[PDB]
Design a binder for this molecule. Structure first.
Ligand SMILES: [Zn+2]
Ligand SMILES: [Zn+2]
Lengths: 357, 39, 35, 127, 240, 212, 102, 145, 89
């Protein structure tokens, strides 16, 4: 209060451990309705490693997998539409274009492929990664696909001419996740050297390096509104303000260990898939873990198989498609007829002992 | 010895500072030269 | 054996319900053609 | 307190602290429609100039299908016309171009502070 | 053994071809970097010997034995201003690491530069590092007898770590010196802040009992039993 | 022709399994002159194995063996897994338990060959590399001694450099090959560099006189 | 029991050298600035050359002492155990490493 | 064809040759991605103080346990930490699915008779006889239980 | 950057007295004398009727690091050789 400022006379009056803590108790998080399992889909011969939703009209999603084949699943009924084979090794990331009928998919077989979704064939193969390619993001409005992998550089691919146009060299380890934003910084990347880079693609250099995580930043996710990115190390999840490189918030992720995937809803629901199945939903603007679920594997499988590997919401934001190690695709529904009363979620309780805030 | 695992992969930082050659590959020939735009 | 508590719908899929030749995005044909 | 600034100038306490913790309703705005077009057209022109560099430098004749003088020197004491030489199509264009290997130095002017948090550090022999 | 300078010049080529060969195959293996960097110190060419440590820091700058050995290499050859720049880059890159901060301190302790460790500690305690830094910073001023300065630290130390073992450490400081006017001022500040900041819920029931008892048993030794007795009533009412 | 197991062949077999593990039997029997890999594998799994217990049965184990032998008559490999005993032990006791109701020098040569083979872990690339380095050092020492003798005769001949194996091959001695300078800091290392240059030139001045 | 973390080990190494610096001043007492060049930007600190010498000697002395305290540990542990079969020194240091696991 | 030849004469070969994955180097590249994935997940589990030495020894247990799964020997390490043992058993079963499904897929090729390499016949011969005896050993234990 | 490159550093006394000079740019001409790495060879003549082509012998990166022109490799200010420049300082 004012007695803190008049006796322990500060120089900032915000950089005190108490004044930060009392404003956290001063504010309440937005309530969100919890999430429940609604459909389990068993269709792959291996792990599901990446899920992409149809960005236009939301009919279907596609799950690239460990059995080297992508399968197209209908969202509503859950039925299997078609199977897209054409890699020889494990498909790591799949991303669909919104302006194009094009599907880009990168495996660990060092190949970046495009797919004519009017024809369901492989067209326009890309070439040049020295090692397995982890991730792809289609740049919005610019006609570039950003691919990155164990190579440790991001190669900016022109679509039409298949040219490694811009190579982004800043990292020290394998890049786990890459994102594309419409303005500068146009490429957001995260690697195993515990850094998150903000790339000025014209100059080819880094605008800002975010060295706040301890261990390999395994997953990032862009917020569909409000222009921010949220990156996950093994212990902590930090939302980042783009165009300043500012640390917006630290989430209340404690004792979660290894966060494999992230996805942000329009309704400020951040999903954090853990390798220990323990899947958690965080308020985005605050950082409150308001729900923490655990999954059931199958009739028979190992205990390690309980692990979420990849996740995204649909276009409406009311469905959550997660792919797990137990060869399953789990659809998570946010249940209706839940109110702030009788479903409060976990209690908003920040502490001093964790230095997170 | 002489048969080892990898401690780190070959980085693309090294090949970026090289000078290019401009050899002409069969798969880099012009093909599918027109992009299709969604409605 | 009735797993996930019967609220959840579990489905095993082994075959594609579409032909592979089915496009997967309808090509936009604006002008009607009679050729 | 004779040298207060000089020690570790690049790291501040402000970089550790979040900004949403003061107000959860801080607005981080989306980029405006006039802002994305100013950045798209700058980037698209830069990319198309790079692609036209790659296609023109390739020795394929079928790559011009898919695609500055009078500079001032000596504080404009001389106006110099810059022209291109008509290349012989048989002699190798870019006579200095070889396939050589170059190791690059690292330009380290400012140190990046590795900004972890402090320290749940007690551990038995379980690992 | 080497006789003349030309035999030395051929000896140095054979080892440097050898070590640069194993470092070309292995960018990693930080121990191999240090043994070649130690080789160049033995050849008395410190310009080369600075270069291997700089090249090894470009591979893994988070490896703490590499930082300490290159700092010690600058200290053993009496290049003190090369070490001040180097430890400055050590704490500016890795501010979390406690070893790199201590390393700056005990060198400037060894040079009797008391105003540089004081300027170093003011910066280090501004980044809120933990209780090992502050407790070594209050132990620093006890060495320097700056009693007015160490009292300013505990004013900041209770604001960085609000907990009774930092408040009761400050009353163990004052009751070590026997100044009665200063001790009850700290005691009055400690018990008001628990009352002022009751709603924040950061001191537990067992934790506030240590403050009330150590206030009362000190007032019992100061022969004022009526202040020992009355505070028990206000604390039980203030916290029922 | 089928040989019997001496205590020398057993102790070679113990050390070889200690060297090679239990899944490389033809490599184990290569040390045993007169002994098949099928024999030495069977000898380990039946006799030598320290997991096996060659103990007398308890009073419970005798009744529990007679119980099994009516359950599974007669399936001795199955019983021996239940009894956790070797199978011939289970048979030979069971026959005795029904009878309760009554009414050098060639060996020392192959030992020395086995002792030599066990203590050699290098292989052909390593052993050739050890020899090639010993030659290369000896070629160096002779060339240095040759120069020292010509220096006694007053003729100064310089050391030949190793020739460039490829085009951009690097003489590490001529220059600092990847000089990464220390980053410029604020503490003005001016007089310290003078003391190094004085000391470094002093050290090379002492090499020209005292050597080392 | 258990191990000591690096932040705790760095403090104890910090405290030990202060006691070496305390007794060094006590053994000495028993026997008997800042200039900032504005043009270059550089800061120059004038300090006693004896204390720079005593800093340089003590680090070499601590380096040799740990070098010798480990060298005797190399010579002792080579001549302690000879029961289990070995081949070379790297086999001996590995099978001893198996003993500390159990 | 000649335009590449002549520029190779004048300029030399590019030093940036990146080998695509092929039928001959698929099994090696499958192992490089597998050791990297196991290395990354175990190193996150580790609280602190793990270097190039400790990451080198833990990748042995993975190689040993894959041999044990092929042998049908149960793989138990005494004193192994249960999170790491949970990780290693997971990736084996990942590799087991690729090991088994490639064995099924190549038998369907051999029965059709459609272009199986001479080495691949012997490899598939060896993969089945692991699976047949493994199925045999499972059936022996189910009768015993 | 291959599409954003500095203008060449040439002396005034290499260019000479005339006003307008027709200079020929070859984008990867010869390789540098110093760093042995290719560059944009500029070459020109002082007058139209001259009989000596004046080439740029070094790249602009080697010309900037020494602060010399590319043609005669004398210092841009003081117009003296490098060995005499570093001796006077
Ligand atoms: Zn040059
Ligand atoms: Zn000139």
């Amino acid at each position: 209060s004012a007695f803190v400022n008049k006796i322990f006379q500060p120089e900032v009056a915000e950089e005190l451990i108490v004044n930060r803590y009392e404003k956290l108790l001063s504010q309440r998080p937005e309530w969100h309705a919890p999430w429940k399992l609604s459909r389990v889909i068993n269709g792959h011969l291996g792990w599901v490693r990446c899920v992409a939703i149809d960005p236009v009209d939301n009919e279907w999603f596609i799950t690239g997998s460990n059995d080297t084949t992508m399968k197209v699943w209908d969202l509503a009924t859950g039925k299997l539409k078609t199977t897209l084979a054409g890699h020889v090794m494990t498909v790591r990331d799949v991303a669909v274009s919104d302006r194009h009928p094009y599907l880009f998919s990168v495996s660990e077989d060092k190949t970046v492929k495009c797919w004519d979704l009017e024809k369901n064939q492989i067209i326009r193969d890309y070439y040049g990664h020295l090692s397995g390619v982890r991730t792809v993001s289609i740049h919005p409005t610019l006609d570039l696909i950003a691919t990155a992998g164990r190579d440790s550089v991001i190669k900016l691919w022109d679509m039409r001419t298949r040219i490694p146009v811009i190579t982004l060299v800043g990292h020290k380890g394998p890049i786990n996740q890459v994102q594309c934003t419409p303005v500068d910084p146009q490429v957001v990347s995260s690697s195993t050297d515990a850094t998150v880079r903000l790339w000025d693609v014209v100059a080819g250099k880094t605008m800002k390096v975010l060295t706040h995580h301890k261990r390999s930043v395994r997953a990032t996710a862009l917020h569909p509104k409000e222009f921010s990115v949220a990156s996950a190390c093994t212990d902590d999840i930090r939302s980042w303000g783009l165009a300043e490189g500012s640390l917006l918030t630290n989430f209340e992720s404690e004792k979660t260990g290894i966060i494999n995937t992230l996805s942000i809803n329009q309704d400020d629901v951040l999903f954090a898939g853990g390798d220990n199945g323990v899947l958690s939903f965080y308020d985005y603007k605050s950082g409150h873990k308001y729900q923490s679920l655990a999954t059931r594997e199958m009739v028979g499988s190992l205990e390690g198989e309980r692990s979420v590997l990849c996740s995204t919401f649909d276009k409406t934001g009311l469905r959550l498609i997660t792919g797990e190690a137990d060869k399953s695709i789990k659809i998570w529904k946010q249940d209706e007829t839940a109110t702030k009363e009788s479903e409060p979620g976990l209690a908003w309780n920040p502490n001093l002992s964790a230095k997170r805030f | 010895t002489s048969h080892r695992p990898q401690l780190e992969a070959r980085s693309g930082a090294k090949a970026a500072a090289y000078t290019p050659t401009g050899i002409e590959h069969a798969r880099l020939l012009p093909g599918h030269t027109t992009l299709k735009y969604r409605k | 054996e009735h797993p996930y508590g019967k609220e959840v719908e579990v489905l095993m899929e082994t075959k594609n319900t579409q032909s592979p030749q089915t496009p997967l995005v309808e090509p936009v044909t604006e002008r009607t053609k009679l050729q | 307190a004779i040298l207060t600034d000089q020690i570790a100038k690049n790291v501040k306490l402000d970089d550790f602290i979040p900004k949403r913790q003061s107000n959860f309703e801080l607005s981080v705005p989306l980029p405006t429609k006039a802002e994305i077009q100013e950045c798209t057209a700058r980037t698209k022109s830069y990319i198309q100039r790079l692609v036209n560099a790659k296609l023109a430098n390739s020795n394929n004749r079928a790559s011009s299908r898919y695609v500055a003088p009078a500079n001032l020197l000596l504080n404009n004491s001389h106006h110099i016309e810059v022209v291109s030489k008509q290349m012989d199509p048989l002699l190798p264009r870019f006579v200095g171009k070889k396939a050589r290997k170059v190791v690059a130095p690292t330009e380290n002017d400012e140190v990046v502070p590795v900004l972890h948090m402090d320290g749940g550090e007690a551990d038995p022999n379980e690992w | 053994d080497i006789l003349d300078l030309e035999e030395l010049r051929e000896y140095q080529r054979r080892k440097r071809t050898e070590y640069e060969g194993y470092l070309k195959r292995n960018r990693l293996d930080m121990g191999q970097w240090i043994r070649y960097a130690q080789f160049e110190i033995e050849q008395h060419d410190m310009r080369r010997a600075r270069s291997i440590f700089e090249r090894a820091l470009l591979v893994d700058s988070s490896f703490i034995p590499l930082w300490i050995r290159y700092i010690d290499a600058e200290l053993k050859v009496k290049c003190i201003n090369h070490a001040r720049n180097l430890m400055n880059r050590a704490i500016s890159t890795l501010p979390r690491v406690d070893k790199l901060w201590y390393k700056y301190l005990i060198v400037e302790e060894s040079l009797n530069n008391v105003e540089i460790v004081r300027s170093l500690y003011t910066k280090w305690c501004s980044l809120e590092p933990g209780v090992n830094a502050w407790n070594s910073f209050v132990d620093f001023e006890i060495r320097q007898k700056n009693w007015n300065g160490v009292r300013e630290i505990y004013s900041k130390y209770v604001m960085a770590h609000p907990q009774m073992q930092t408040w009761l450490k400050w009353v163990r400081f004052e009751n070590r010196h026997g100044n009665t006017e200063f001790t009850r001022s700290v005691y009055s500040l400690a018990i008001d802040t628990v009352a002022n900041l009751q709603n924040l819920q950061i001191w537990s029931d067992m934790e506030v009992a240590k403050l009330v008892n150590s206030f009362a048993h000190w007032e019992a030794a100061q022969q004022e039993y009526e202040r020992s007795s009355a505070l028990y009533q206000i604390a039980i009412e203030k916290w029922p | 022709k089928g040989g019997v197991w001496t205590n020398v062949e057993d102790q070679i077999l113990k050390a070889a399994v200690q060297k090679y593990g239990t899944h490389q039997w033809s490599k184990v029997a290569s040390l045993l002159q007169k002994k098949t890999a099928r024999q030495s594998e069977l000898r380990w799994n039946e006799y030598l194995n320290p997991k096996l217990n060659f103990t007398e049965f308890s009073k419970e184990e005798d009744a529990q063996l007679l119980d099994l032998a009516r359950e599974l008559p007669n399936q001795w490999r199955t019983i021996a897994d239940m009894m956790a005993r070797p199978a011939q032990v289970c048979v030979e006791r069971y026959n005795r338990l029904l009878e309760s109701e009554d009414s050098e020098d060639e060996e020392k040569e192959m030992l020395a060959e086995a002792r030599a083979r066990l203590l050699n872990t290098q292989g052909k690339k390593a052993t050739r590399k050890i020899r090639e380095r010993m030659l290369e050092e000896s070629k160096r020492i002779a060339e240095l001694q040759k120069r020292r003798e010509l220096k006694q005769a007053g003729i100064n001949v310089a050391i030949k450099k190793p020739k460039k194996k490829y085009g951009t091959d690097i003489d590490y001695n001529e220059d600092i090959v990847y000089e990464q300078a220390p980053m410029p800091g604020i503490y003005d290392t001016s007089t310290e560099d003078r003391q190094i240059k004085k000391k470094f030139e002093q050290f090379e001045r002492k090499v020209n006189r005292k050597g080392l | 029991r258990g191990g000591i973390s690096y932040d705790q080990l760095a403090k104890l190494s910090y405290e030990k050298t202060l006691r070496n610096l305390a007794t060094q001043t006590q053994n000495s007492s028993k026997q008997d600035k800042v200039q900032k060049d504005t043009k270059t930007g550089k800061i120059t600190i004038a300090d006693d050359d004896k204390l720079v010498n005593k800093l340089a000697v003590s680090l070499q002395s601590e380096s040799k002492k740990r070098y010798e305290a480990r060298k005797r540990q190399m010579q002792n542990a080579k001549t302690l155990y000879g029961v289990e079969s070995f081949i070379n020194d790297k086999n001996k240091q590995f099978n001893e490493k198996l003993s500390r696991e159990s | 064809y000649i335009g590449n030849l002549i520029t190779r004469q004048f300029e030399g070969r590019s030093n940036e040759i990146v080998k695509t994955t092929t039928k001959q180097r698929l099994d090696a590249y499958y192992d490089l991605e597998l050791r990297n994935s196991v290395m990354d997940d175990i190193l996150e589990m580790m609280p602190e103080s793990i270097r190039q030495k400790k990451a080198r020894t833990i990748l042995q247990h993975l190689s040993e346990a894959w041999r044990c799964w092929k042998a049908n020997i149960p793989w138990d390490v005494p004193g192994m930490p249960a999170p790491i043992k949970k990780i290693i058993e997971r990736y084996i079963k990942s590799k087991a699915d690729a090991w088994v499904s490639a064995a099924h897929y190549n038998r369907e090729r051999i029965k059709r008779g459609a272009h199986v390499e001479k080495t691949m016949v012997k490899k598939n011969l060896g993969r089945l006889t692991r699976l047949w005896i493994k199925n045999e050993q499972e059936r022996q234990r189910q009768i015993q239980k | 950057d291959e599409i954003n490159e500095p203008p060449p550093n040439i002396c005034e006394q290499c260019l000479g007295d005339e006003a307008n000079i027709r200079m020929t740019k070859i984008p990867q001409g010869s390789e540098c004398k110093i760093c042995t790495l290719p560059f944009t060879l500029y070459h020109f003549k002082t007058s139209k009727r001259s009989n000596n082509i004046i080439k740029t012998l070094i790249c602009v990166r080697c010309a900037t690091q020494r602060n010399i022109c590319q043609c005669c490799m004398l210092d841009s200010r003081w117009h003296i050789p490098i060995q005499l420049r570093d001796h006077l300082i």
